[PDB]
Amino acid sequence: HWGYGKHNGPEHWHKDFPIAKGERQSPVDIDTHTAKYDPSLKPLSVSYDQATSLRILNNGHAFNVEFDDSQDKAVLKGGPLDGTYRLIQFHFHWGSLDGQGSEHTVDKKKYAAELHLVHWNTKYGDFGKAVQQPDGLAVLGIFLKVGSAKPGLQKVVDVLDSIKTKGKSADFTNFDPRGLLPESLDYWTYPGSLTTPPLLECVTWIVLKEPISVSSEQVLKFRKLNFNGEGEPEELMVDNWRPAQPLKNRQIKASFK
C-alpha cells in the first residue's frame, strides 16, 4: 500500500520496509566539492546498439519501458563495475513543478526529473536473484532539465495517453534508448539501493554529470499520467520521487577532473 501520498509516502515506508533506515539507502545529495576524483575508474561502456525494447507499463508508481534481458543485448560494463549488467527496464521520477522531481540532487539542486536505466549482473542469472546481492544491480541515473526538447524521448511521450492508468500496458518495440543519453558519460558513483520499496541495498549507482534537456511540453505530459487505475478517482502521477537520504559511511567517487 506504499505510495507517494501524505499517508503512504517516503516517511512511512520504514514501517513495512525497515531497510528504509539502512546504511546504504538512495538517493543521496551529491556534494560536488566532496566527491573525490578516482583516477582508477574506467570509462563507462554503454552498449545499447542491440537493445530489444518490448513494452511500456504504468505500474501505479511510474511507467517502465521493458527490454528483453534473456540475452546479452543492451549491456552496461566498465566504470566502477566488474562484469556485465543487462538492461531490464528504464523509468523516470518527476515532479509536479519544474523545480523538483529528481531523486539525487547536486549540491542540493533538484532537477525536473530523473531517468533510471536499470541493469542486473549476469553472474546472478536473473533479476530476482540479483536484487539479493550487494553488487546485483547497476542503475544509470540521468537528470532531466527543462529547456529544449529531447527528440529521443518523444516516442515515449506520445504513447503515454495509452497507458494513462495503473495496470495499463502497450507495445513499445523498436525503441532506441541511446536517444536518452547526454553527450558526456562523466559520472559520480556510490553504493546504494532501489529508491522505492523493497529498497534493497543491491545497487551500484552511476549518475551522469551532464543532464539531458527535455521540453516543458514533454514533462507536462508525464504529469497527465495517473497513479490510480481506470474507473477510480483521478490522482495525477506527479512527485513520485524519494528525497535524499543520509550518506552515512559512504564516499561518492567522480570519474572526472
Ligand SMILES: S=c1[nH]c2ccccc2o1
Ligand atoms: S531505481 C529502481 N529500479 C527498480 C527496480 C525495481 C524496484 C524498484 C526500483 O528502483
Ligand SMILES: [Zn+2]
Ligand atoms: Zn527509480
